[PDB]
Curated annotation (Swiss-Prot):
UniProt family annotation: Belongs to the GFP family.
Organism in which the protein naturally occurs: Aequorea victoria (Water jellyfish)
Keywords, alphabetical: Chromophore, Luminescence, Photoprotein
Effect on the protein upon substituting Q75R: In Azurite; shifts the excitation and emission spectra to shorter wavelengths and increases quantum yields compared to BFP
Effect of V188A: In mut1.5; shifts fluorescence lifetime from 3.03 to 2.72 ns
UniProt effect for mutating I162T: In P11; increases fluorescence at 475 nm excitation and at warmer temperatures such as 37 degrees Celsius. In Esmerald; leads to brighter fluorescence. In VisGreen; leads to brighter fluorescence
Entry protein name: Green fluorescent protein
Record note on quaternary structure: Monomer.
Impact when changing D150V: In EBFP2.0; shifts the excitation and emission spectra to shorter wavelengths and increases quantum yields compared to BFP
Pfam families in the record: GFP (PF01353)
Effect of S197F: In H9; increases fluorescence at 395 nm excitation
Annotated function: Energy-transfer acceptor. Its role is to transduce the blue chemiluminescence of the protein aequorin into green fluorescent light by energy transfer. Fluoresces in vivo upon receiving energy from the Ca(2+)-activated photoprotein aequorin.
Length: 226
């Protein structure tokens, strides 16, 4: 089974190419994940100069196969079951009173490395808004994302709202609609309703001159009990 690929720490590569209001940019992330504790450690660099949107707005776009599913929940782990062939993850992310992202990603093994490759399009972002104006706190709140089976597409869906703190004390909501489908034609696990619970730390590498984000995340599945 795909879960067998996640017994220990696995290297991760993330490649995002973006187009937000016509601003073209790229991000490359490298690090590793361990589904045994749900821990991700990654460093992301903007390889095209300054990132023209705020780093925190890309966290959800930038590998749910690394979530820690408790033993009694293993039968509900769609994400690992799709491996190694992987899955497509698509989202629309709507920023309240501002623009929206559309993302298409493939998450799959390329050799021994788990790769998340994303094409992101942003439109209708506002001049001097929180996104293009970089007015968001460099942080990311703990958060629960509810997962549901989507039998008609042999995959899963999720809808959740991220609260991005704005530096004037307001909040910038980002409403995510997500759908995942397997890349391969083998059997996958279609889950009962549950959620993924996240804890994140965003920091900086003091020796890195490029625009970048160091990310530490824990992701734990919950909501189904004994």
């Amino acid at each position: 089974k795909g879960e067998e690929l996640f017994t220990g720490v696995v290297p991760i590569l993330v490649e995002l190419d973006g187009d937000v209001n016509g601003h073209k940019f790229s991000v490359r992330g490298e690090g590793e994940g361990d589904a045994t504790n749900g821990k991700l450690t990654l460093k992301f660099i903007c390889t095209t100069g300054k990132l023209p949107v705020p780093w925190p707005t890309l966290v959800t776009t930038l590998v749910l196969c690394f979530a820690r599913y408790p033993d009694h929940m293993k039968q509900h782990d769609f994400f690992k079951s799709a491996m190694p062939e992987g899955y497509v993850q698509e989202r629309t992310i709507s920023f309240k009173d501002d623009g929206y992202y559309k993302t298409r990603a493939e998450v799959k093994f390329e050799g021994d490395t788990l790769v998340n490759r994303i094409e992101l399009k942003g439109i209708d972002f506002k001049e001097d808004g929180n996104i293009l104006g970089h007015k968001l706190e460099y942080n990311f709140n703990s958060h629960n994302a509810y997962i549901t089976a989507d039998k008609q597409k042999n995959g899963i869906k999720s809808n959740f709202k991220i609260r991005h703190n704005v530096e004037d004390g307001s909040v910038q909501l980002a409403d995510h609609y997500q759908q995942n489908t397997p890349i391969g034609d083998g059997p996958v696990l279609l889950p009962d309703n549950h959620y993924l619970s996240t804890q994140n730390k965003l920091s900086k590498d003091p020796n890195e001159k490029r625009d970048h984000m160091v990310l530490l995340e824990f992701v734990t599945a919950a909501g189904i009990t004994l």
